[PDB]
Amino acid sequence: TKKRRNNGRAKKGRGHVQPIRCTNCACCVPKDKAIKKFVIRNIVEAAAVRDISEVSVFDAYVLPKLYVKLHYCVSCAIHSKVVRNRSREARKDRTPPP
Amino acid sequence: KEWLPVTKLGRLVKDMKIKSLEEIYLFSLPIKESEIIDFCLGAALKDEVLKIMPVQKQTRAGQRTRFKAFVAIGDYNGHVGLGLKCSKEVATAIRGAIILAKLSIVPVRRGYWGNKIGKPHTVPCKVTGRCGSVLVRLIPAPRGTGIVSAPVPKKLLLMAGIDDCYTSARGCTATLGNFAKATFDAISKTYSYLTPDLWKETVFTKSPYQEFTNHLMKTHT
Amino acid sequence: VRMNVLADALKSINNAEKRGKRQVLIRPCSKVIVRFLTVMMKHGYIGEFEIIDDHRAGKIVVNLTGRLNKCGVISPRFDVQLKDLEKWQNNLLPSRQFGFIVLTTSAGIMDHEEARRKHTGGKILGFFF
Amino acid sequence: MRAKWRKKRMRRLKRKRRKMRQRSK
Amino acid sequence: MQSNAGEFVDLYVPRKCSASNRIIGAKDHASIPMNVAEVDKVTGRFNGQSKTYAICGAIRRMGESDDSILRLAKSHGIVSQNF
Amino acid sequence: GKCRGLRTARKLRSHRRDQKWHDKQYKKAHLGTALKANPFGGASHAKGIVLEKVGVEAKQPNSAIRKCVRV
Amino acid sequence: GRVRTKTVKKAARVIIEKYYTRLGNDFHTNKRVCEEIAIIPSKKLRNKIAGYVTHLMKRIQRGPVRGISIKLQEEERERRDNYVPEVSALDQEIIEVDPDTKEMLKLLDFGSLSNLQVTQPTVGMNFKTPRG
Amino acid sequence: SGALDVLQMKEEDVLKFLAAGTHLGGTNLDFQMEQYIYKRKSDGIYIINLKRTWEKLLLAARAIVAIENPADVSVISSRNTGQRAVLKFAAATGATPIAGRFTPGTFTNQIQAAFREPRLLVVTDPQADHQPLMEASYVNLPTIALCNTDSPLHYVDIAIPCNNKGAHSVGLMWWMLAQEVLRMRGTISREHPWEVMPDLYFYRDPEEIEKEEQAAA
RNA sequence: AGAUACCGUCGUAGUUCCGACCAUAAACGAUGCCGACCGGCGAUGCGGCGGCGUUAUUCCCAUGACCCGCCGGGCAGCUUCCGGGAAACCAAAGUCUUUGGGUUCCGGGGGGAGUAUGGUUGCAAAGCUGAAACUUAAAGGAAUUGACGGAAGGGCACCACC
């Protein structure tokens, strides 16, 4: 039985896209197939920003950010709880969760 | 014993103010009282249990066996019904499928093969009906042909007051519910077929909800 | 490509009838399309149609009633003797009381009933009931 | 038995049959 | 629906949609015979005589039921030709 | 059919002829393999001489020993 | 876990709905009302019903409750719902009107009114929400 | 209704539509509602043609006055906006009001206590009141519906093109059609204006009820 | 336990380029191609057409960037009692017992078997073509209910924990 209409990927008029290597494993995943996050992240979380602000040389120093783009295989993504199994009606919602 | 009508239409039927269900079927009125058909065609209505079918749902502990009863009803002169009722015991299933059949009775238009003399004997045109995979085709036949058919639609067409008919089923007819429904869908579509007989532009007679709109206000709440 | 023009036209007015449209545009006008339609008109199945001359193959607008159950083509145009015409009206028409099988004879494009009168068989074009 | 490895075993078996039929030629 | 003698032989003559001219089955429960009240043209009051338009379920679920009644009332002199 | 041409009689016929060999009942009755292989040689009955009496085990669910004869 | 069951609430609603005027806010008086106007076989259930009755009576003092009806229904939804102002919000001196609403009034009989201020049109044709 | 001076659209009725804003339709458009629109504005709003609004109001009024029993014309609104207007329409016309929470199977299930069985539904919004429309499919019930440019005409059998969103425009359309059915019954004369005020039918914000209670003293 | 596995450190053929072979993939949209007809809506890509207004070349022209629509062709999307279908689902998988627009390939219960054998192509690996004897009452498709999970989430208990 055809589960997903798009087939779980995002090529409609190609027939081939290039494989990315999954960041967690090294699995080769079609680019369109891969579950992609763009993690902007402060180099220090919450406990260390308290300390840097006080031990900074500079005057109200804005801290730099660490811009990763994570590519996951479907198996890695579900195991690491990035994506998740949904009900057959709720599968069709392409809205990203708030 | 004494029937008490709850719907608007049932109240008219009981008081002898709509005097034949021909008048109900003219306005496509949903019959939901069982005793409307027991009132009009009451003596010419005969019941044959087509099949008792045990169905089961798998539960924590064993199966929950309920019984599906197909009842074909109809007077051997114009009307057929087909009622399907699933229940825990067999007597409740049969009785419920008799009621659902009565509610569901339709009039069959019946025409002529070639020569148009006497009373009508056959289906007026080739009419297919279906549900599931089962496609049933009913074909007009000459007088005295009988109902050339499988024993299930033969049993409904007898009940429809059709003397003569050629059939031609298709798909999994072994599943009786589909086959009985498909042949009932086929005779349903006789008064839903626009022949040249039915071209004379419609004269809209007054509804029974309009003809007796002043009576219904006082007769009940 | 477009090969049977009569086929395109008959299916077009069939799909328009099924929807419940009051008139339909059938894009290529032949002579055979007009004859078929006139035969359907004379038996009251369609209203007064009209052809639209652009200096090409014309278009026809047909005023549909709700009388036409189905309007079909038979492809290819099989060649029907008077003996065979009963076996075509047995397996291509619903009843023996109504419905017609239009066939091109040497006399002209006409229904099976006029073909029987004139004692002239011909090639089947299609049917309507 | 996976249908791919069935197809691999039938190839090896054929490849041994072509090896044993050749030795009479 | 005469026989050879002339006797009307079928047991009821079914209504037929005023929009599409397609007959309305005994169990087309989405049908609607709508009565439109008439007017004494000098007064603007209900006469007692009324125009009756039937519509089959098929057109009602098709969403064309209002435009059908609009044409039928305009084609009856109820709605202005201007509109 | 799929080719509804007025002059498609050899395409319609030769196609049926070719596809009729995928019918199992036809191929059996229209090759010489099923008949040359048949012990009776395409007869209703046949006489043979009993050489031993055999006890054949019933396939399973129902487990009895069916008294056949090797002929 | 002091949640009232359906037997308590149904009884307590019907007791208010039919005998509203006999009740009050005191528990102990309408305890004895519930004794008279109903045949309750338990003392505990009698108290439960009397208790929820009093709770619903305090709720009715605030405003109307979703699962009960009061005789007029109730001097606000009946009487005050017949509110009429001095002059209607429709009866406006200067009615602002779009140039294209002026056009469809011009293609009506009403091409010239006295009390219609035809406005300047909305420049910068930008009326949608951006995508994503 | 058409080509009659008696039932022609009057001058005061245009000012009641322009103040209410019944001409002022939604941003979006249904293909079934292109025939009840003059033109589109700059700043994506569709202008409803009030002449065609008026003809559909009369045709609806005809449909209601044709129903000889005034009781069995069931008048329905779910949204707060209509709940007052439809309840005052019952007072006037002698109709049956269902203001808020239309219980499914009130036309289809007999054994339900609120089993109504009308001859004609009147509906404030085909979208909000989708469940009455759908049960009108299962019992032969012609349906008048106050429709917007956005509204779908699924199972609505005569559409009155309006603003059915705004507080004033709804109550005014209910007032107009209540006054028209009582005119066409011959209850009220047409020369004089009507005693009942069009402002009566308007739903008010519960802010405005306590604002009037404050401004009454 | 074994671990000619999964894990790890190395690591030849290969992986890269040129010249010749090879001709197969879940080579998939598991959906042949051409043509007509049959709902709606918002997008988007390309080209053209029209239209208030912002903006750059400032010195305006006309071009770009936007905005608002129209048309055609394209990858798609959402919605719908068109209609179809065993159903999942499908604006095509519709216009089908009311069966015929044109045309090519191809299937005929499950195995045996893509096997044997002959032919043919290839350096080879292997490709294309391709049975039968025999064996068997099911194999299978879609969906439903349960049970189960080393899948996700929620709830409860001192016969759980803190």
Numbering used by the authors:
A (entry chain b): 2 to 99
B (entry chain D): 58 to 278
C (entry chain X): 2 to 130
D (entry chain n): 1 to 25
E (entry chain W): 1 to 83
F (entry chain Y): 2 to 72
G (entry chain S): 2 to 133
H (entry chain B): 2 to 218
Task: Show sentences the authors wrote.
Colony collapse disorder (CCD) is a multi‐faceted syndrome decimating bee populations worldwide, and a group of viruses of the widely distributed Dicistroviridae family have been identified as a causing agent of CCD.
The IAPV‐IRES seems to follow the movement of the 40S head, pivoting around the anchored PKI and SL‐IV which are exceptionally stabilized by ribosomal elements from both head and body, effectively “clamping” the IRES to the 40S subunit. All elements of the IAPV‐IRES included in the produced construct were identified in the maps except SL‐VI, which proved disordered—no density could be assigned to it even in low‐pass filtered maps. The IAPV‐IRES inserts two elements of its structure between the head and the body of the 40S subunit, effectively restricting the dynamics of the 40S head to specific ranges of conformations. In this conformation, the IAPV‐IRES fully blocks all three tRNA binding sites of the 40S subunit, interfering with early steps of canonical initiation (Aylett & Ban, 2017). The IAPV‐IRES is able to establish a stable binary interaction with the small ribosomal subunit.
